[PDB]
Amino acid sequence: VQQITLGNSTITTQEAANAVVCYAEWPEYLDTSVCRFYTLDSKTWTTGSKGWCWKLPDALKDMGVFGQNMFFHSLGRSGYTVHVQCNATKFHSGCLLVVVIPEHQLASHEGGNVSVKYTFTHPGERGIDLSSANEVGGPVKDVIYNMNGTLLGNLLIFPHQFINLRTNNTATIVIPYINSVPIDSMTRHNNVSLMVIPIAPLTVPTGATPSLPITVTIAPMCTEFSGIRSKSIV
Amino acid sequence: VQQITLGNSTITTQEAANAVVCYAEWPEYLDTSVCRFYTLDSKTWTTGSKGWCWKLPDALKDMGVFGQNMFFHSLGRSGYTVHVQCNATKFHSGCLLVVVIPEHQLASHEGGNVSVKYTFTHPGERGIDLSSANEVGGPVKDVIYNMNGTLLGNLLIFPHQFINLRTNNTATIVIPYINSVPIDSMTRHNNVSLMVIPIAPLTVPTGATPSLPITVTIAPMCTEFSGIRSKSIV
Amino acid sequence: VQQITLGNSTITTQEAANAVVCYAEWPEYLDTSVCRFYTLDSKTWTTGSKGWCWKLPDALKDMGVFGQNMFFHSLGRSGYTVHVQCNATKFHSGCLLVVVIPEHQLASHEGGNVSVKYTFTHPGERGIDLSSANEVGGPVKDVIYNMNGTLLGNLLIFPHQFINLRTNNTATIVIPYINSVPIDSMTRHNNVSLMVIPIAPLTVPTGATPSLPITVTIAPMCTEFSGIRSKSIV
Amino acid sequence: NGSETDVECFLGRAACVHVTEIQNKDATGIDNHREAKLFNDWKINLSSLVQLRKKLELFTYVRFDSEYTILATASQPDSANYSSNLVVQAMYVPPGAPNPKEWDDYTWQSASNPSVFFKVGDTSRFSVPYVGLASAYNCFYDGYSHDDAETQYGITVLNHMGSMAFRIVNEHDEHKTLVKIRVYHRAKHVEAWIPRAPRALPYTSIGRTNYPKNTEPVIKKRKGDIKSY
Amino acid sequence: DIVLTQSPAALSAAAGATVAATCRASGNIHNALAWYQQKAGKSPQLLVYAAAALAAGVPSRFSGSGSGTAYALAINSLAADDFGAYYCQHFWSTPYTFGGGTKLEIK
Amino acid sequence: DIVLTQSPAALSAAAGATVAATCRASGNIHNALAWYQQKAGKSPQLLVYAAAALAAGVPSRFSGSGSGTAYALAINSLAADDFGAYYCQHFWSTPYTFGGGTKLEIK
Amino acid sequence: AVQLAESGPALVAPSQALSITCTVAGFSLTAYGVAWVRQPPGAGLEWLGAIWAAGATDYNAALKSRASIAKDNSKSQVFLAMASLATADTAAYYCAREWDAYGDYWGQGTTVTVSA
Amino acid sequence: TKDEVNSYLIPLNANRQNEQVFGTNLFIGDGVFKTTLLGEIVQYYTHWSGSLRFSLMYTGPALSSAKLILAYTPPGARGPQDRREAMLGTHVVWDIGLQSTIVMTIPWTSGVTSAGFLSCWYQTSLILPPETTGQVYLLSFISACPDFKLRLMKDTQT
């Protein structure tokens, strides 16, 4: 409701139909182990922001017991509950598109057979700042083509949710495990990518700071790992 | 409720007891023909506005199928549902008196046996701008005497409703057919006159535009016409 | 019978089996709106008349509420009841062929790929005077080939009726909606064409005027229009 | 009512996925058996056809049995004296199997590579099941394959559909005959998951979402303003 | 604050001419304006309050008009007593600032 | 109001040098900026609208850039026709103020 | 073709009015608005105001009181009037069409000098 | 002249009454719809013939308010050229202050001038919150109603 406690973590939130369960499939086994809220560093949505992109499970790779079990076990299988909250007054306008893209293969900014380096396809808690400059070996950051050559308007076929600061300030997207294999290596392959894209730009009133924090809180749910490293050899 | 569809028209509004049925008499025969929302041109309630006055059925004389049947048929009989909506922030103050006056015979600004011309007793969708200058042959526009020699405070005996921008922004007045004849010529005789009068002046905050739109939406209901022009001669 | 009242119109006629329902199919939905008798200008059947041709719904395109709704609505669907009455004494002879031709595509009088202009394929209440001169862009008017290259004797396969002035003076042909689409634009496409063709020439006695009026009375029945322009957008 | 919009019917139609050209001539003193076009192998790549690539990449995953129709037509643009009656071996190399390097290799007689022997002018037809390693093919792969090192980001061997190799079984005549082979793939029993955005920009690589630089705007401009209908 | 700019500064007219002093405000006074008359070494006296209403002991030669921001003080058929400095003061929003002032002199 | 400060005031360059005029606003225009070119005694003509989009009849030598408050007008490989005064105008919030202006002269 | 011919008297004494017009040939004032921009000689362009495509007008912050803009929709004429004229009003006055709410199709402009 | 996020944003402007906000025809194979998900899959086939689901989304501040009137001109008719002709036809008077998202179902068309028009007009001027001036934006959405058919599959080239 407003004191959702998951593990030793607790967040305060608002919902009436806020959870977007992706493709109407709740995450389920093929909690109570690594299921807690991991609250990423708040991004600053300024007036000239282009967007942010976090890879999952790569955004949670240093996050405590989850990131420990991610590198301890080879194979894993996790769903997610992603809360994106952009707290504001009733004077801010603007609109975020919080979208979850399964298998978001990125495009390099050099074209041809040039591929994106592991430094940039796995950026961690920092994510990809889409308003920054293209670095050598990084992805293309042109937000109109969704970093993959497909237009930004057609990004609503993926499980998405708007944060219209006029209407709400939170977006919850309940991600299941989406892959073509039943279990996979969590360290070399990103299942989904969370993107938070300002479509309508942030307008502040005169007398307000032209910036606004965005908090992403990812709770991994129904997280499984491989039976090896605890399976007996007898 | 908030998507009131009448014909191919639709308006979005608010009500809890908003409809003022005049004299507790709902309009009734002695819909589904000309019953739709006709939305007049929005008036600009500036800080130095004195009021507006629309004659009915004269305000709807060019309004599509209603204004076509008004000049096609001689005799007619219509009730009205008048929505007056003055959208504003929670920073505007001021108060409108939305009043409906049956048989509002106007006073000429020259006195004596001088009568008001047909150009001014039938002003149409434009209405009478009570803050403008008296023209030759027009009515008197002194709002304190209600254009008829009776004081503005006593105008609440007519079926009225306040728009206090502190409290609400809409006024709905459901007008029946009020006449001493059962049916009458709609083109030479105005049954009621809608007036929208600012009693408390519009005060804007510093940083706001000293003006505010007022939308009048008149839906003619229980509209009848004479049986001639379709009665058979055999 | 003899005082057939349809709307505010009334005609006086004679029938015993006079109505020719085309292809034994009464017109029916997929009255009481535009269903009245529209009585065209009476043609003068002189001794050297070759015939007349009216396109439907083009003959009723300026006819009141029907012609208003024909240009207001794009799509429409109408059947017809066409009364052709040639009042005469018991001294006139001669024979009219009142024929209704579905999809009467006309032939141009120049041959080849020359097509007939919209001025002439849609002649209105006037119709096509088949005894007049061929104009530039008009149809061929040679009545033996029915304006389409098919002989006049074979025109009885279409739903027809004779007016033999010896026997009768009226012809009633009840036309249904005949098209390959369920509804169509009434302003660009003529469903049927009424033709009134003198086969046996008009012979008058000595002492009579060598001319005789022909009255065409078209009553559109089961007239439907498209649900758009009154369908709600909500 | 909407049976053309099924993914069994939208993705399941025979497109031309490969057109190769092999020659019948002698290997006497022939070094390279590909520059001579004595044979041609082709890694089965449905994303080589950008019309079928743009339809397959409307989905994240796709699982289909395959269906190959092979049309071989001859041509003799020299002095010939006769049109030869030729037989083509159309050999399906499965995923993980070695490809031919010569037209007279051991691979052509390998029993585990299924091969079709058909006449030129006639047509071949066979079906290959779902030979992927995942439970579906990956139209898009956000990550690396099999390795912690650099593995090109989306280039994965899970989407290996096999290989088709083509030679003429016949020996040479005194004239050169040019056989052009057209492979027609039809995805059958198609099923697809996670519908994606349609691709607006053209392609630069296979297996990569890279679009060309300084390309043209796909959203086309009005002839007037935003108010112009 | 609401700043009153009283234009002109001084006028030369004869006893019988029409004098129209003018005040224009920055903000909107909503007709809460008062006009004052002052002689040399005498106290200011109130002529017009509420921008139209003549005060007590004021002749009908004076006539306040105007609404909103601009306000005129039309004086018709001047007398000999009606020469002096004229000051607006708005009474709307605390502070109650004055205008500049219009003095009258004889031609 | 949004006040445009167009720096510099005038530039001396040859036909082929790169000219980068600059506008910087007080408020945030949100890329709703238009650049103009004017000759001596001629009407101003529109070069760049929306701070990046070249207008109709504009060569590809001109290139609008910049976002937010600062906006550059980079001109590459000048011609003989491209000498004149260049003015920004923002079209965001009514008033639509101009900048100062950059004139081009030959070295 | 979209053209806006400016027309003015160009010889006006100060503390007077201006009747400097723009006949509109090519488009309609009901579907597009017209922006007014003046330029004194030596100094740069200065916005005056814009009447919108249906009635509404905007002005300079310093010239709300002096300037006033109206239009005739049938005759396609746009009217600019100014009060309390000074020597700083010596400027070529221009009209425009509002293209994507920007300003283009500027006429050649009438130079209107306020002199004694 | 380039693709950007600003092309998805329908700009709204204060002190504009009885002007038009946007206007488009409803050919969903050309124009604004050619690159959408509907119009990329419509242009794989030849004949569509269904109802559309058209949405708008107001993204300006919570204190701002306006009335926009959203006209549907059916095919065969002329799109309106003032606010009043839009009101005399099929419309919604949509109060931006109250309803932040409107959903409008375009009637069944078989649209393959023609296909219909769709415009938006300022009923009232846009009232902005104090010292928050500039432009606010609309986001427009298109989809298909579930009676939408699609037949005779064809091939786009490049």
mmCIF file with all atom_site columns, N, CA and C in Angstrom, chain D residues 58-76:
data_model
loop_
_atom_site.group_PDB
_atom_site.id
_atom_site.type_symbol
_atom_site.label_atom_id
_atom_site.label_alt_id
_atom_site.label_comp_id
_atom_site.label_asym_id
_atom_site.label_entity_id
_atom_site.label_seq_id
_atom_site.pdbx_PDB_ins_code
_atom_site.Cartn_x
_atom_site.Cartn_y
_atom_site.Cartn_z
_atom_site.occupancy
_atom_site.B_iso_or_equiv
_atom_site.pdbx_formal_charge
_atom_site.auth_seq_id
_atom_site.auth_comp_id
_atom_site.auth_asym_id
_atom_site.auth_atom_id
_atom_site.pdbx_PDB_model_num
ATOM 1  N N  . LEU D 1 58 ? 9.794  -8.203  -36.338 1.00 0.00 ? 58 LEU D N  1
ATOM 2  C CA . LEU D 1 58 ? 8.619  -7.645  -35.706 1.00 0.00 ? 58 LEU D CA 1
ATOM 3  C C  . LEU D 1 58 ? 8.297  -8.403  -34.430 1.00 0.00 ? 58 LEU D C  1
ATOM 4  N N  . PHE D 1 59 ? 9.077  -9.440  -34.134 1.00 0.00 ? 59 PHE D N  1
ATOM 5  C CA . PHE D 1 59 ? 8.920  -10.301 -32.977 1.00 0.00 ? 59 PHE D CA 1
ATOM 6  C C  . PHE D 1 59 ? 10.291 -10.530 -32.366 1.00 0.00 ? 59 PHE D C  1
ATOM 7  N N  . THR D 1 60 ? 10.327 -10.816 -31.066 1.00 0.00 ? 60 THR D N  1
ATOM 8  C CA . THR D 1 60 ? 11.615 -11.110 -30.448 1.00 0.00 ? 60 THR D CA 1
ATOM 9  C C  . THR D 1 60 ? 12.037 -12.545 -30.723 1.00 0.00 ? 60 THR D C  1
ATOM 10 N N  . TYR D 1 61 ? 11.143 -13.495 -30.479 1.00 0.00 ? 61 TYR D N  1
ATOM 11 C CA . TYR D 1 61 ? 11.426 -14.901 -30.693 1.00 0.00 ? 61 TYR D CA 1
ATOM 12 C C  . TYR D 1 61 ? 10.511 -15.437 -31.778 1.00 0.00 ? 61 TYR D C  1
ATOM 13 N N  . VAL D 1 62 ? 11.010 -16.415 -32.523 1.00 0.00 ? 62 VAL D N  1
ATOM 14 C CA . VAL D 1 62 ? 10.219 -17.079 -33.549 1.00 0.00 ? 62 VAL D CA 1
ATOM 15 C C  . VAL D 1 62 ? 10.697 -18.521 -33.648 1.00 0.00 ? 62 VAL D C  1
ATOM 16 N N  . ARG D 1 63 ? 9.755  -19.453 -33.688 1.00 0.00 ? 63 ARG D N  1
ATOM 17 C CA . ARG D 1 63 ? 10.055 -20.874 -33.789 1.00 0.00 ? 63 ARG D CA 1
ATOM 18 C C  . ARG D 1 63 ? 9.283  -21.421 -34.972 1.00 0.00 ? 63 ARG D C  1
ATOM 19 N N  . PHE D 1 64 ? 9.991  -21.977 -35.947 1.00 0.00 ? 64 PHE D N  1
ATOM 20 C CA . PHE D 1 64 ? 9.340  -22.551 -37.111 1.00 0.00 ? 64 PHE D CA 1
ATOM 21 C C  . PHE D 1 64 ? 10.125 -23.735 -37.648 1.00 0.00 ? 64 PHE D C  1
ATOM 22 N N  . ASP D 1 65 ? 9.397  -24.726 -38.150 1.00 0.00 ? 65 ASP D N  1
ATOM 23 C CA . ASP D 1 65 ? 9.982  -25.724 -39.028 1.00 0.00 ? 65 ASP D CA 1
ATOM 24 C C  . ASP D 1 65 ? 10.233 -25.095 -40.388 1.00 0.00 ? 65 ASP D C  1
ATOM 25 N N  . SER D 1 66 ? 11.251 -25.575 -41.081 1.00 0.00 ? 66 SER D N  1
ATOM 26 C CA . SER D 1 66 ? 11.621 -24.998 -42.361 1.00 0.00 ? 66 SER D CA 1
ATOM 27 C C  . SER D 1 66 ? 11.133 -25.872 -43.503 1.00 0.00 ? 66 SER D C  1
ATOM 28 N N  . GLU D 1 67 ? 11.169 -25.303 -44.697 1.00 0.00 ? 67 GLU D N  1
ATOM 29 C CA . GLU D 1 67 ? 10.612 -25.933 -45.886 1.00 0.00 ? 67 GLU D CA 1
ATOM 30 C C  . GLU D 1 67 ? 11.323 -25.317 -47.073 1.00 0.00 ? 67 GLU D C  1
ATOM 31 N N  . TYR D 1 68 ? 12.207 -26.074 -47.704 1.00 0.00 ? 68 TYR D N  1
ATOM 32 C CA . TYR D 1 68 ? 13.058 -25.549 -48.756 1.00 0.00 ? 68 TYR D CA 1
ATOM 33 C C  . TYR D 1 68 ? 12.618 -26.122 -50.086 1.00 0.00 ? 68 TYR D C  1
ATOM 34 N N  . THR D 1 69 ? 12.342 -25.243 -51.034 1.00 0.00 ? 69 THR D N  1
ATOM 35 C CA . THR D 1 69 ? 12.086 -25.623 -52.408 1.00 0.00 ? 69 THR D CA 1
ATOM 36 C C  . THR D 1 69 ? 13.208 -25.069 -53.264 1.00 0.00 ? 69 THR D C  1
ATOM 37 N N  . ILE D 1 70 ? 13.880 -25.943 -53.994 1.00 0.00 ? 70 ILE D N  1
ATOM 38 C CA . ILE D 1 70 ? 15.088 -25.589 -54.716 1.00 0.00 ? 70 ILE D CA 1
ATOM 39 C C  . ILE D 1 70 ? 14.832 -25.768 -56.196 1.00 0.00 ? 70 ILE D C  1
ATOM 40 N N  . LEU D 1 71 ? 14.985 -24.690 -56.954 1.00 0.00 ? 71 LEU D N  1
ATOM 41 C CA . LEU D 1 71 ? 14.773 -24.682 -58.394 1.00 0.00 ? 71 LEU D CA 1
ATOM 42 C C  . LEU D 1 71 ? 16.116 -24.456 -59.070 1.00 0.00 ? 71 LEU D C  1
ATOM 43 N N  . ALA D 1 72 ? 16.577 -25.444 -59.828 1.00 0.00 ? 72 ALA D N  1
ATOM 44 C CA . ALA D 1 72 ? 17.834 -25.359 -60.556 1.00 0.00 ? 72 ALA D CA 1
ATOM 45 C C  . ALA D 1 72 ? 17.539 -25.281 -62.045 1.00 0.00 ? 72 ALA D C  1
ATOM 46 N N  . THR D 1 73 ? 18.020 -24.224 -62.693 1.00 0.00 ? 73 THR D N  1
ATOM 47 C CA . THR D 1 73 ? 17.827 -24.008 -64.120 1.00 0.00 ? 73 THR D CA 1
ATOM 48 C C  . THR D 1 73 ? 19.181 -23.824 -64.784 1.00 0.00 ? 73 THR D C  1
ATOM 49 N N  . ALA D 1 74 ? 19.361 -24.446 -65.943 1.00 0.00 ? 74 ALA D N  1
ATOM 50 C CA . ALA D 1 74 ? 20.646 -24.432 -66.620 1.00 0.00 ? 74 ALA D CA 1
ATOM 51 C C  . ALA D 1 74 ? 20.726 -23.305 -67.643 1.00 0.00 ? 74 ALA D C  1
ATOM 52 N N  . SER D 1 75 ? 21.929 -23.129 -68.181 1.00 0.00 ? 75 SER D N  1
ATOM 53 C CA . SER D 1 75 ? 22.267 -22.068 -69.117 1.00 0.00 ? 75 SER D CA 1
ATOM 54 C C  . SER D 1 75 ? 23.605 -22.386 -69.758 1.00 0.00 ? 75 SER D C  1
ATOM 55 N N  . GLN D 1 76 ? 23.714 -22.217 -71.070 1.00 0.00 ? 76 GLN D N  1
ATOM 56 C CA . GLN D 1 76 ? 24.926 -22.564 -71.812 1.00 0.00 ? 76 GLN D CA 1
ATOM 57 C C  . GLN D 1 76 ? 25.241 -21.451 -72.791 1.00 0.00 ? 76 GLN D C  1
#
